[PDB]
């Protein structure tokens, strides 16, 4: 997260932080057993960390469990990242508290000028690198469909949506991927891609939730 500011320890308890020996992409906590994160997140031996805010040192309040099986989208297009959402089952159930939570999933999707929190332990830098040890946050407005398409280079399908500011300054960045944008108290977006980090007129762009609902659901019950 870039122009971001400290979200406070576990103030965002649904967000997970992927592991395979260091962190790598971010994801949310569903219900005691999924997580959704994004599909080029994608990796074998992957550990889910919940309830965790400096990723760095075991300070209480951490349950890691290992992925028992990872679920990317059959439509997903590694060259375009459309469809860029996959589901993650936890080995065992988490224990849910206050410091561990799930986020609701969306019963529709939300409109141009909604504002929403995005998270992560990702680049802090526009320019260089520089991975926080704590979780960063970041509120963030969803842009119209117009302004959308107009900046972005790559094509934008109707599966992602635009958010954040025209201006630059603020963005999600590397190390966000996977990561959650809640709107309203429903998940409405996970950090995909984008075009530099905070750059002018170069937004990010996230994976839209809401046409994925029922794939989500039918998914998970089956597995
Ligand atoms: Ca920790």
Not at 56 to 61: A, F, H, K, P
Not at 82 to 98: G, H, Q, T
Not at 147 to 171: H, P, Q, R, V, W
């Amino acid at each position: 997260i870039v122009g971001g500011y400290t979200c406070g320890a576990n103030t965002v308890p649904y967000q997970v932080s992927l592991n395979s020996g260091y962190h790598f992409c971010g994801g949310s906590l569903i219900n005691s057993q999924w997580v959704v994160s994004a599909a080029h997140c994608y990796k074998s031996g992957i550990q889910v960390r919940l309830g965790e805010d400096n990723i760095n040192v075991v300070e209480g309040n951490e349950q890691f469990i290992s992925a028992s099986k990872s679920i990317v989208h059959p439509s997903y297009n590694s060259n375009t990242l459309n469809n860029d959402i996959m589901l993650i089952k936890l080995k065992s159930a988490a224990s849910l508290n206050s410091r561990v939570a799930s986020i609701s999933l969306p019963t529709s999707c939300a409109s141009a000028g909604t504002q929403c929190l995005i998270s992560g332990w990702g680049n802090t830098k526009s320019s260089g690198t520089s991975y926080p040890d704590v979780l960063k946050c970041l509120k963030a407005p969803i842009l119209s469909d117009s302004s959308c398409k107009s900046a972005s280079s790559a094509i934008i399908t109707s599966n992602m949506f635009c958010a954040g500011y025209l201006e630059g300054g603020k963005d999600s960045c590397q190390g966000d991927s996977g990561g959650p944008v809640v709107c309203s108290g429903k998940l409405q977006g996970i950090v995909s891609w984008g075009s530099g980090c905070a750059q002018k007129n170069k937004p990010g762009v996230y994976t839209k939730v809401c046409n994925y609902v029922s794939w989500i659901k039918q998914t998970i019950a089956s597995n």
